[PDB]
């Protein structure tokens, strides 16, 4: 039913289970954790499975000085758009996985010796 559907924020708040007696006292531990993902991130308004080209929404409104008409990407070219979105999705996932490590301190699990950077700039345009 269309009327039983909820928003993404509602769906993630439930699925993530970050508020609860499990998360109050850390009664639940998370080697495997549900991670929030923004599913509207790479989505373009006007783009759908059917591959329609709506002038003024997802394609330019005017082409060669004339107003474009409703058109539909053919099966072959629509198939390449879908494939390109999948690669862009896995590419976005790969870039996030890559992160720059920080030098350890006196030992691998010790905080001692680790740099915290400069102190924050003071309210009156003071800097350190």
């Amino acid at each position: 039913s269309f009327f039983t559907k909820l928003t993404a924020d509602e769906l993630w708040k439930g699925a993530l289970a970050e508020t609860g007696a499990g998360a109050k006292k850390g009664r639940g531990k998370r080697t495997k954790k549900k991670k929030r993902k923004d599913l509207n991130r790479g989505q373009i308004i006007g783009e759908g499975r059917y591959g329609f080209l709506w002038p003024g929404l997802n394609v330019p409104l005017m082409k060669n000085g004339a107003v474009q008409t409703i058109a539909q990407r053919s099966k072959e070219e629509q198939e390449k758009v879908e494939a390109d979105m999948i690669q862009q999705r896995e590419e976005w996932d790969r870039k996030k996985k890559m992160k720059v490590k920080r030098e350890r301190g006196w030992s691998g699990n010790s905080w001692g010796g680790i740099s915290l950077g400069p102190p924050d700039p003071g309210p009156c345009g003071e800097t350190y």
Binding site: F2, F3, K5, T7, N40, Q43
Partner: peptide, 14 residues
């Protein structure tokens, strides 16, 4: 009213 609110939420996403 319930439909119009859902329709507009998904029609003007974000």
């Amino acid at each position: 009213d319930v439909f119009l609110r859902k329709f507009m939420w998904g029609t003007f996403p974000g």
